[PDB]
Structure formats: structure tokens, C-alpha cells
Design a protein that fits this description.
The complex is a heterodimer of chains A (215) and B (209). Chain A is mainly beta and 215 residues long. Chain A folds into 2 domains: 117 residues, Immunoglobulin-like, CATH 2.60.40.10; 87 residues, Sandwich (Immunoglobulin-like), CATH 2.60.40. In chain A, the strands form 4 sheets. In chain A, strands 2, 4, 5, 6, 9, 10 and 11 form a 7-stranded mixed sheet that branches. Chain B has 209 residues and is mainly beta. Chain B folds into 2 domains: 99 residues, Immunoglobulin-like, CATH 2.60.40; 93 residues, Immunoglobulin-like (Sandwich). The radius of gyration of chain B is 24 Å and the shape is elongated. The chains are: A mainly beta (215), B mainly beta (209). Bound molecules: Carfentanil (84K). Carfentanil (84K) sits at the interface of chains A and B. The PDB classes it as immune system.
Chain lengths: 215, 209
């Protein structure tokens, strides 16, 4: 089956240019389908950006049409999106998609996984604080304090620890800054013996921290 | 150009009807997509009434001129998702999308919250700051109240509490943060987080090391 995968920078400066590429695998760019880009701001609905045929013919959303470039490159079996003069309104998850187009109707029959692109103007790096943890289970965690904008990713032990992990939704404080916590529930017996490290990444401020959580 | 209701709620095993209205539906047809959190949309009804292979038989579609409807029979908790209708404009130049309908499945069993309360980290105190973190998980329905106490006196200032949000197991999670000065933290014998849920309370207490 055909698979689509977006790639490209996840952070763009205001008035800069967003640039994404869709790699098509398992089939050819050359076909009766059209290839498109669709975006979805966090918590909002879908918005179509535009479409391209394998010959290069393009057709864009008129509300974006001056800022959009969609291109095809059959040698690499890819198609790409450039969105110029970006603002905060352009922060969204971007999806590449395949369209099935008939004489009078069309629809979307295949989607990439989506990639978040954030237009970063103001930013603030978080502080990362361990939340230190008898029998039973024990809770330990990491507090990611006072960052902007979203998002932050948290993993544990480089992704080797997944069972018992709960990363809570961030709080928007009255300061206009975000905080979040991530907690692992582990057997109390493994504390003195197993090392626990929370891997925090706030890409907008390039805050990448691996914080050891000890008793 | 395409109109669908922002929300629909049903009980497990009932039938959900999601409508989509638009003057282009007769000529340009309607297509329905299901979208779950952190996932791309998935086509569940093709060209008004066709179900793709691999879509459960409880999904069906119908057409009524300027309106098309997605019907989900015997709704299950796993059907909770956003549903988008899609068509095209009258000139067949551009796709059109509805705003999306959030389908909520009610009838989940009541569940009491678990509470974890953390004191300020030594690292934070060295930064001349203090945050207490109260984490509340695995409750239902998704409404809780949080009350902080210094020793046994209510604390209202410096409290930041999230709106409960659904976890990947269909229960709710929330968190509350209490900011203090290091002096406040060391002055009192303890601080408590009191979490109330459906008239029941759970309380956790922490104290300076
Ligand atoms: C060669 C010119 C050409 O074909 N088209 C065209 C028309 C004007 C300008 C540029 C390109 C289109 C067309 O007419 O469909 C054959 C215009 C519509 N596009 C489909 C829109 C769509 C996408 C997804 C869901 C629903 C609808 C497809 C191409």
C-alpha cells in the first residue's frame, strides 16, 4: 500500500517560510490521484491548503493563495509545501494527503501521520525539577515549570519506560505561562536499584534536559 | 458552506445521528471522516452511503438532498471521536469541510480519584521558589474541586488548577499547583491538598524535610 510521511522543520520564525516535504512510498507520484496538504490548528477543524497533480498543475485555497507553493519532484517521489510570511495563525498540525478526484466529486483516501509546525515569536524555557518519591507502589515525577509556547515532550529512561507513565495536561497559569508534570508509578522495591531519568524537550526554547530523579 | 452540529452525546448501545447540511451535497456528495486524538482522519463513509471495507458494519450513511447523515448503531466507547463531513464547492474547485462534530459517549461508571501530592524540590527552593503539585487521576465524572490548606487554614491565593481532561482510558485527570515562597513553605507544619469528587474527599499532606 502507499504510505505518506511528512518531514521538515517544526519551528518557524514569524514572517519566515514554513517548508514541509511529503515522501510517498509504495507507489508513484505519477497517477490519477491528486496530492494535497491539509492543516489543523490545535483544537480546531480541518482546513485544506491546496493540491497538486503529478504534472505540476496546482490549485490553492484562495484565502492562502498568495503565500502557498506546492511542488512535485518525481525523481524523489515526493511533493512539498512552502508557506511564506507565516504568523501565529499558521501554527497547526500539517497533513499530506492523497485525493481521489472524479469528474464531479473528490475526497481524501490516504493521510500522513501529521507534523506539528509552530510559529515561535516569544518564548520562555522551563525549569525542570525532579519530584522525588515502604512497600506498595511509589510515585515520582518531573515538574516542567513556566514555559512558552506549547508543547513540551516528556519521556522516561529514553523511552524504555512506558508502563505507569502519566504526563498530565499542561496548566495555563495566570502568568500566561505553561507548566506540566509527568509522573511514573513504579514498585517501591525498584527505587534503591533502578535509575529514573525524565527526558524533557521544549524545542521552541531548545531546552533539552535529562533529569535524574532520586530519593 | 457545510454545517454540522458541534457536539452529539449518546449512551452506550444507543444510535448516534450526525447530520451535515449544505447546498452542494446533492451534486458534490458527502464524505465522512472519523478523527481520534493525535491521529489523522479516517474515511468511514464514502460518497454518501458506501462503507469502506474495514469499517465496522455499525457505521452507515444516508442522503437527504441538502443534508447527509452519519449513523452509528450500538455506539461503543471506542467511537468517541470528532466526525467531519466533507464535500466540494459549487464550482468543483475546492473541497469543503464541516466544522466537525464531537461525539461523546456517556454512561461510564463512577470512579473515585487517586491523588498524589509532591512538595517543593530542593532545586526549586535553591532558586528561591516553591511549588506544591497535586495530581488527580482516574476519576469520573470529570468534575472535581481542590482545596489547599496551610496547616489547617484555607489557602486561596497562588492556586492554579486545570480543567479536568479525559485520559486514554476514558477516565479524567486534573492537576493543581500551589505557589509559595520558601519562607511560607518552611514556616508552617504542613500543607494539604483536599480533592472532593461527588461529595467524597481525599486529602494528602506534605511537610518540609
Ligand atoms: C486540470 C484542472 C483540474 O482538473 N482542476 C483545476 C481546476 C481549476 C484550477 C486548477 C485545477 C480540478 C478539477 O477540475 O478536477 C478534475 C479542480 C478540483 N480539484 C479537486 C478539489 C477537491 C479536492 C478534494 C476534495 C474535494 C474536491 C481537482 C482538480
Amino acid at each position: 500500500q502507499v504510505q505518506l510521511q511528512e518531514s521538515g522543520p517544526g519551528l518557524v520564525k514569524p514572517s519566515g517560510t514554513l517548508s514541509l516535504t511529503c515522501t510517498v512510498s509504495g507507489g508513484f507520484i505519477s497517477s490519477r490521484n491528486w496530492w494535497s496538504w491539509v492543516r489543523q490548528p490545535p483544537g480546531k477543524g480541518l482546513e485544506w491548503i491546496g493540491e497538486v497533480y503529478h504534472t505540476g498543475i496546482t490549485n490553492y485555497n484562495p484565502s492562502l493563495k498568495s503565500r502557498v507553493t506546492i511542488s512535485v519532484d518525481k525523481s524523489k517521489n515526493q511533493f512539498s509545501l512552502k508557506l511564506s510570511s507565516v504568523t501565529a495563525a499558521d501554527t497547526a498540525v500539517y497533513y499530506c494527503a492523497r485525493e481521489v478526484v472524479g469528474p464531479t466529486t473528490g475526497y481524501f483516501d490516504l493521510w500522513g501521520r501529521g507534523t506539528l509546525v509552530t510559529i515561535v515569536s516569544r518564548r520562555l524555557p522551563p525549569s525542570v525539577f525532579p519530584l522525588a518519591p515502604s512497600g506498595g507502589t511509589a510515585a515520582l515525577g518531573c515538574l516542567v515549570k513556566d514555559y512558552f509556547p506549547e508543547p513540551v515532550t516528556v519521556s522516561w529512561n529514553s523511552g524504555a519506560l512506558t508502563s505507569g507513565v502519566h504526563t498530565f495536561p499542561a496548566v495555563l497559569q495566570s502568568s500566561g505561562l505553561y507548566s506540566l508534570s509527568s509522573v511514573v508509578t513504579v514498585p517501591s522495591s525498584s527505587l534503591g536499584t533502578q535509575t529514573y531519568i525524565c527526558n524533557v524537550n521544549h524545542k521552541p526554547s531548545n531546552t533539552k534536559v535529562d533529569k535524574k530523579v532520586e530519593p | 458552506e457545510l454545517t454540522q452540529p458541534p457536539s452529539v452525546s449518546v449512551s452506550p448501545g444507543q444510535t448516534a445521528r450526525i447530520t451535515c447540511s449544505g447546498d452542494t451535497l446533492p451534486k458534490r456528495s458527502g464524505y465522512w471522516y472519523q478523527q481520534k486524538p493525535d491521529q489523522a482522519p479516517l474515511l468511514v463513509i464514502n460518497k454518501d452511503t458506501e462503507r469502506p471495507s474495514g469499517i465496522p458494519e455499525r457505521f452507515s450513511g444516508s442522503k437527504s438532498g441538502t443534508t447527509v447523515t452519519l449513523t452509528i448503531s450500538g455506539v461503543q466507547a471506542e467511537d468517541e471521536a470528532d466526525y467531519y463531513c466533507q464535500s466540494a464547492d459549487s464550482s468543483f474547485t475546492y473541497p469543503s469541510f464541516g466544522g466537525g462534530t464531537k461525539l461523546t459517549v456517556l454512561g461510564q461508571p463512577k470512579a473515585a480519584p487517586s491523588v498524589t501530592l509532591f512538595p517543593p524540590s530542593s532545586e526549586e527552593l535553591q532558586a528561591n521558589k516553591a511549588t506544591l503539585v497535586c495530581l488527580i487521576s482516574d476519576f469520573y465524572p470529570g468534575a472535581v474541586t481542590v482545596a489547599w490548606k496551610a496547616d489547617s487554614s484555607p489557602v486561596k491565593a497562588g492556586v492554579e488548577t486545570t480543567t479536568p481532561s479525559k485520559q486514554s482510558n476514558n477516565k479524567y485527570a486534573a492537576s493543581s499547583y500551589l505557589s509559595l515562597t520558601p519562607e511560607q513553605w518552611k514556616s508552617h507544619r504542613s500543607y494539604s491538598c483536599q480533592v472532593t469528587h461527588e461529595g467524597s474527599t481525599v486529602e494528602k499532606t506534605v511537610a518540609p524535610t
